[PDB]
């Protein structure tokens, strides 16, 4: 029985553990994402310093909770992995009793609800990772992308990016994307994802992972050569002037 409290109230009215937990997200691996009318795309990166990574033994940064539901995170890897297992166990329980596949709205409030407990319970450290929950709903083609935060507050975002140099890359997603006219083509959502990752990490042929989510329980994982094709088309057309 470890009873020692952690979360307190700062003189300004905030929590010290919550403030420093969000700093680990901005200092972690940056991950972008977008969603169109019929599709949603979640991009990632890989450290270019020392790369021995083999494609088979490298764990994917975007976890798959359900056939039509995907889960990505930018932040602490190990603290997120515990919630990834609990999300898949809850997906089994939600499909068991209720006989319904887990949705994005239910998974968001669950992860935000679990993270909320560790913040309000003395003796456990709150998580320092902010997960990005995406995917579709049963018999629904509308993409649901909800931003889960370590504090427990969640919202919906069409284009959201958290990680290093986040304030700079978010300015590109506002000009290159509109709320009233989202791209209806699954290929256009991939091009908008690459354009956001070219301003952070140079090169990045095999260092970028892009996951495409399709309706009717279909997920197409782009290989290393398939992602490089979209990189060449954008870089050659960016240099026209």
């Amino acid at each position: 029985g470890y009873d020692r409290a952690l979360s307190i109230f700062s003189p300004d009215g905030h929590i010290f553990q919550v403030e420093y937990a969000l700093e680990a997200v901005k200092r972690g691996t940056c991950a972008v994402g977008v969603k169109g009318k019929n599709c949603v795309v979640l991009g990632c990166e890989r450290r270019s310093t020392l790369k021995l990574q083999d494609t088979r033994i490298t764990p994917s940064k975007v976890s798959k909770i359900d056939s039509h539901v995907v889960l990505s995170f930018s932040g602490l890897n190990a603290d997120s992995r515990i919630l990834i297992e609990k999300a898949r166990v809850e997906a089994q329980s939600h499909r068991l009793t209720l006989e319904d596949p887990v949705t994005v709205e239910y998974l968001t409030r669950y992860v935000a609800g679990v993270q909320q407990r560790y913040t309000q319970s003395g003796g456990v450290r709150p998580f320092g990772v902010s997960t990005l929950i995406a995917g579709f709903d049963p018999r629904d083609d509308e993409p649901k992308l909800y931003q889960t935060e370590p504090s427990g507050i969640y919202s919906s975002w069409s284009a959201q990016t958290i990680g290093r140099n986040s304030k700079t890359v978010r300015e590109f997603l506002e000009k290159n994307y509109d709320r009233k006219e989202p791209p209806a083509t699954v290929e256009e959502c991939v091009k908008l994802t690459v354009r956001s990752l070219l301003e952070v990490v140079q090169t990045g042929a095999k260092n970028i992972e892009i996951t495409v989510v399709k309706p009717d329980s279909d997920i197409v994982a782009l290989s290393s050569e398939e992602i490089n094709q979209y990189v060449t088309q954008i870089e050659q057309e960016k240099q026209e002037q």
Binding site: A24, R27, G28, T49, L76, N77, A78, D79, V129, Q202
Partner: protein, 108 residues
Amino acid sequence: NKIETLDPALIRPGRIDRKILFENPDLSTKKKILGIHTSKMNLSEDVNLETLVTTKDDLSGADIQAMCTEAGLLALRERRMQVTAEDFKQAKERVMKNKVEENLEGLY
């Protein structure tokens, strides 16, 4: 460099409202610092200022001056008055690795 040690009465708020931070130099500013040192420094026709600034740690004015300084020592040890393009690339990696590399890799 630090305004915390200055006299707050000497600041006289409302007379001076302008506090300008420091911004990192772009590709254009870095070529200006190189043009001063590489002017007298011997360089072949394969030495271009755009290649050196392409891959860089975004060094300040002190490390950029030290980059061309280390490149001159490679020619002195080999007893040659003409510095090739390999010395600028070799000296660029040494100064880049003396500032930030892995940032003590971590954060799970």
